[PDB]
Design a binder for these strands. Structure first.
Ligand SMILES: [Mg+2]
Ligand SMILES: [Mg+2]
Ligand SMILES: [Mg+2]
Ligand SMILES: [Mg+2]
Ligand SMILES: [Mg+2]
Ligand SMILES: [Mg+2]
Ligand SMILES: [Mg+2]
Ligand SMILES: [Mg+2]
Ligand SMILES: [Mg+2]
Ligand SMILES: [Mg+2]
Ligand SMILES: [Mg+2]
Ligand SMILES: [Mg+2]
Ligand SMILES: [Mg+2]
Ligand SMILES: [Mg+2]
Ligand SMILES: [Mg+2]
Ligand SMILES: [Mg+2]
Ligand SMILES: [Mg+2]
Ligand SMILES: [Mg+2]
Ligand SMILES: [Mg+2]
Ligand SMILES: [Zn+2]
Lengths: 125, 127, 60, 206, 155, 98, 80, 24
RNA sequence: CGCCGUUAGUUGCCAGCGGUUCGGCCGGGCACUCUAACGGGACUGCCCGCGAAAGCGGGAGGAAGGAGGGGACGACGUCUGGUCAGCAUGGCCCUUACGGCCUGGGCGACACACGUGCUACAAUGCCCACUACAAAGCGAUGCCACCCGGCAACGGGGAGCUAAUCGCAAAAAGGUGGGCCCAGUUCGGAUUGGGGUCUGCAACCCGACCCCAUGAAGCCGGAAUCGCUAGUAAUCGCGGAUCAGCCAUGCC
């Protein structure tokens, strides 16, 4: 059904389904099911309208999820770019932030390789 | 009453005790068929028996330690053929030509420096 | 290394996290087997001289 | 770049250890250091005695020390003199009540270390390298020995392009553990750099 | 093999059919030295052979194997020019192995969700002369010989 | 109890530690529990053969520490004055804790 | 991921120097080399010259900056 | 796989312990 | 390392008896396994065939047969090979700095390129639960059983070990049950937000581990190219050196 704000999981197990929501996955599913009282195993189709409700009125009113998360997280980063902060510069620049190496391997944070040339004579090794 | 053989395979040592009986084997305080549970080998550790006519004419209790159950399996396979020679020693006529009394001296090879895995040498670049 | 830098000898190092072994023999700071107090080479050299007891070459 | 140490190679057999004790992990470290400290002293103030090996046994505070010299005059001194100063020179550093037995070397030219030094001593004095060596070997051969070999490294004759000089007679079966092949090395500090001197002496099988 | 000739290893016979042409097949099904997995795959495959046909699996197995091994293949060679695909015989020990291998590879091409089922259906289909695997055999033999022109390197 | 565990670096020299330490209360004296082996502890050092680079040569050393048990059952004190005051080997150690 | 449990470290060379300036006026530029000291409420308002390994730096210290360390605001190496 | 730290086997590789691989 | 023997029983067990809190737990044995010492065994010795002889081929007996398997062991010399930065050492050079002490930063930078690796792209698989079977090691300014607190890292208590006796210690693939349904997924675990624990005077630059959220690339890799002949490759985990901690996926 429509468990969390503007979101809709279906037709696989409920615990796996709620993963499809933003601030939720396994860990928060195993919990919000045990605490809500629904068997984790049933397909989403087989949930009592009453059950979906006990789930939805819990999951929403107990956790920062979806947009409310991914917009505050984005603002949680603007804060670092707001002040002087290193990670802020490191966010502006677009490089690692967890103090990794950048000479090889920042490919995920940078994006695909922007290849350039060499010099005159040198090893083309 | 008693009959005995040792048996070894990759530092795995079985202790075999043959006794007149019904075929009910017991390894480490357990049924032979529920200690080697699911291992499709296992039934292969008795091959000296079903090849000199034994099996259910005999019973066997067994101490085993060191290694992993397949070595433990082969070390039994030996230990029985040994105890079975401590019986009628003529058990060799049609027992030795089949192997059984041999001791597979194949052992894990030493890890050597400059290689990853004794023989697996490190790969390289520009020759 | 520099004879000056030989001062792990310097008993008080303010805090232990500045304390660092050197080879008692050659002063190397970089392969000091705790047991012996020797570095990689000093270890091998003395071993061959037979000056550190009960140490053979291992073969297995 | 080849060749292991003919002593260290044979250590289990033919040739035994120089230091000779036992010690837990909390001990060995500074204990062994001491042993070397004693060896270090036992060459500065003991050079001219012509010393081969400094054995060092040990029980709990019965640190042996058993200096092997060819000329046990200079070790003992005039009367029993020099060996009194040194026994209490080993007490200044090692607080562990030491001995200092001294066993003479019967035939110095059958112990490689000594041989090796005589050759090095000759060269530090300016001398005939290529001759000195063949001499040094003949001595080790006229003194018995089933064979012997001596090597001086390079900058031979105060030269320019380092060399390596040879000379070897009889058998020197470097690959066999049933050997007994003394090995000694002497430095030879000269006017123009060092020169390594190795000596080998084969004396009998089993 | 510069020096000697190398003997084929004599593999310990089966535990259920007592056949060495089986542990042969079982080794090839094996990966990363997990032999128990392999047996559990194959003996299971035998149980599915028995379901979808009254025939003993061991005569079904051997049937497909014989049906797969090639009588000819090609082997590149040169003196000059370019690599000439030379047709030639397939010496029995190799027919044995080429068949076993292709069988397994072909088996693992199938869409069948699990192995054993894959093995069964591939073991079956090959007995019936169809099912890719025999693709290799035929498309080997057909592609060899089609270079008859270069068969004058008999060996 | 008369704990007497012997440990050094040489095994030839741990016979000059169990033989006379039994040949004292062996057939004349008491009984003795016989010199029992006890597994040894070896320590490997793996030094790189040259100074400077050549990552792949190395050379292995070891420092084997051999053991024995003994334990003199039924302790008359006459053997003791003979046992506690008779020794021979240098590089050996004794532990005594009844 | 943060890290410090209890004893939220703030080096003391300027821990009292910051609050000795909270007895009168906020003195302009009170340089340190302890880029390791955490910012703490009594630091709000001042201006700390943190070293680079090369230069001290005018770090005007606001309200958002608190959990952090000064070094986070005095960038070391310099880039293309 | 051995990469995920929220797995049993990802924790055996790490040689560590946690919610995902308790120490008995 | 592989077979057997003698010596040795605070490790060993329905071998064989007594008790059982059914735990070798206890009395008690040293047979067996094992631990670590000393031996025996193997040499083409025996057999058939070819050979002038060495030797070659098969066969027997045997744990093993032709070098049974793996080490350690590197000839005269070669590359004016590497190392003045481990250490020596000739010469040359600096001597209010080319020496010395500090605090801080850098060796961890990032348009890019290569080497060696790790984790993958999955069903011969991933997850969870339960249940087996190792070897080699390390350990008192230590390893930490066990009991509490905590989702956990870990914190507070606390037994035994100076170690075949106590602990690290869980081996893991495996086996039994359960789940997942072909999907960028219950594959993969990068990245980033947040909260914590720990070691250290101190974790911003720049530590490891835990938990929550995130869940990127990756559907087996162009031209090229590497390793391995048998307990090998392949795969699975376990330990050690260095070391407060750790960037180890490295090494042994
Ligand atoms: Mg392996
Ligand atoms: Mg110097
Ligand atoms: Mg340190
Ligand atoms: Mg080599
Ligand atoms: Mg996963
Ligand atoms: Mg009873
Ligand atoms: Mg034995
Ligand atoms: Mg002959
Ligand atoms: Mg040789
Ligand atoms: Mg150079
Ligand atoms: Mg500094
Ligand atoms: Mg670097
Ligand atoms: Mg490169
Ligand atoms: Mg708890
Ligand atoms: Mg299942
Ligand atoms: Mg691939
Ligand atoms: Mg080969
Ligand atoms: Mg460590
Ligand atoms: Mg590691
Ligand atoms: Zn050194």
């Amino acid at each position: 059904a429509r468990i969390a704000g503007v979101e809709i999981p279906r037709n696989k197990r409920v615990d796996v389904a709620l993963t499809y929501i933003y601030g939720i996955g396994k860990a928060r599913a195993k919990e919000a099911l045990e605490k809500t009282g629904i068997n984790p195993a049933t397909r989403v189709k087989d949930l009592t309208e009453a059950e979906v409700v006990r789930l939805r009125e819990y999951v929403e009113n107990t956790w920062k999820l979806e947009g409310e998360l991914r917009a505050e997280v984005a603002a949680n980063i603007k804060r670092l770019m707001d002040i002087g902060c290193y990670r802020g510069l490191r966010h502006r620049r677009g490089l690692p932030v967890r103090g990794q190496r950048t000479r090889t391997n920042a490919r995920t944070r940078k994006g695909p390789r922007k290849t350039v040339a060499g010099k005159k004579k040198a090893p083309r090794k | 009453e008693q009959y005995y053989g040792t048996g070894r395979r990759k530092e795995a040592v079985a202790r075999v005790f043959l006794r007149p009986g019904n075929g009910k084997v017991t390894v480490n305080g357990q049924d032979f068929n529920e200690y080697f549970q699911g291992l499709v080998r296992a039934v292969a550790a008795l091959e000296p028996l079903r090849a000199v006519d034994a099996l259910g004419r005999f019973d066997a209790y067994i101490t085993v330690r060191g290694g992993g159950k397949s070595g433990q399996i082969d070390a039994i396979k030996l230990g029985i053929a040994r105890a079975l020679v401590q019986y009628n020693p003529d058990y060799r006529a049609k027992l030795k030509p089949l192997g059984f009394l041999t001791r597979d001296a194949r052992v894990v090879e030493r890890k050597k420096y400059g290689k990853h895995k004794a023989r697996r040498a490190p790969q390289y670049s520009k020759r | 290394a520099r004879k000056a830098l030989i001062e792990k000898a310097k008993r008080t190092p303010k805090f232990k996290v500045r304390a660092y072994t050197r080879c008692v023999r050659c002063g190397r700071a970089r392969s000091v087997y705790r047991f012996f107090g020797l570095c990689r080479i000093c270890l091998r050299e003395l071993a061959h001289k037979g000056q550190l007891p009960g140490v053979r070459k291992a073969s297995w | 770049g080849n060749k292991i140490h003919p002593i260290g190679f044979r250590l289990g057999i033919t040739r035994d250890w120089e230091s000779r004790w036992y010690a837990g992990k909390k001990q060995y470290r500074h204990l062994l250091l001491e042993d070397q400290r004693i060896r270090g002293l036992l060459e500065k103030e003991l050079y001219s005695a012509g010393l081969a090996r400094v054995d060092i046994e040990r029980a709990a505070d019965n640190v042996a020390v058993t200096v092997h010299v060819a000329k046990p005059g200079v070790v003992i001194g005039r009367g029993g003199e020099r060996i009194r100063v040194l026994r209490e020179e080993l007490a200044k550093l090692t607080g562990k009540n030491v001995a200092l037995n001294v066993q003479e070397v019967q035939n110095p030219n059958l112990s490689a270390p000594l041989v090796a030094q005589r050759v090095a001593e000759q060269i530090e004095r300016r001398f005939a390298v290529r001759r000195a060596i063949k001499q040094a070997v003949q001595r080790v051969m006229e003194s018995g020995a089933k064979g012997a070999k001596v090597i001086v490294s390079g900058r031979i004759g105060g030269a320019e392009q380092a060399r390596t000089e040879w000379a070897a007679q009889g058998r020197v079966p470097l690959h066999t553990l049933r050997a007994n092949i003394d090995y000694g090395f002497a430095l030879a500090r000269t006017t123009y750099g060092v020169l390594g001197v190795k000596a080998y002496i084969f004396l009998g099988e089993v | 093999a510069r020096r000697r000739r190398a003997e084929v290893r004599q593999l310990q016979p089966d535990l259920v059919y007592g056949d060495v042409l089986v542990t042969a097949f079982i080794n090839k099904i094996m990966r990363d030295g997990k032999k128990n997995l392999a047996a559990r795959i194959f003996y299971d495959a035998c149980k599915i052979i028995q379901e979808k046909t009254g025939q003993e699996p061991l005569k079904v197995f051997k049937q497909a194997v014989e049906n797969v091994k090639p009588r000819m293949e090609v082997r590149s060679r040169r003196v000059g020019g370019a690599n000439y695909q030379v047709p030639m015989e397939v010496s029995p020990r190799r027919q044995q192995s080429l068949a076993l291998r292709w069988l397994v590879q072909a088996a693992n091409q199938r869409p069948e969700r699990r192995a054993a089922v894959r093995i069964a259906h591939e073991l079956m289909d090959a007995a019936e002369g169809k099912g890719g695997a025999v693709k290799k055999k035929e498309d080997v033999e057909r592609m060899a010989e089609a270079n008859r022109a270069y068969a004058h390197y008999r060996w | 109890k008369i704990r007497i565990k012997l440990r050094g670096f040489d095994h030839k020299t741990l016979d000059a530690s169990a033989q006379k330490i039994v040949e004292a209360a062996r057939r004349s004296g008491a009984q003795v529990s016989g010199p029992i082996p006890l597994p040894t502890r070896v320590r490997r050092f793996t030094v790189i053969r040259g100074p400077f680079k050549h990552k792949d040569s190395r050379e292995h050393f070891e420092l084997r520490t051999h053991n024995r048990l003994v334990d003199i059952i039924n302790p008359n004190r006459k053997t003791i004055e003979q046992l506690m005051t008779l020794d021979l080997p240098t590089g050996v150690e004794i532990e005594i804790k009844t | 991921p943060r890290s410090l449990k209890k004893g939220v470290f703030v080096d003391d060379h300027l821990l009292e120097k910051v609050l000795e300036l909270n007895a009168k006026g906020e003195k302009r530029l009170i340089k340190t080399w302890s880029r390791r000291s955490t910012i703490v409420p009594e630091m709000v308002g001042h201006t700390i010259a943190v070293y680079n390994g090369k230069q001290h730096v005018p770090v005007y210290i606001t309200e958002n900056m608190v959990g952090h360390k000064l070094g986070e605001f005095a960038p070391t190496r310099t880039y293309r | 796989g051995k990469g995920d730290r929220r797995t049993r086997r990802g924790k055996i590789w790490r040689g560590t312990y946690g919610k995902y691989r308790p120490r008995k």
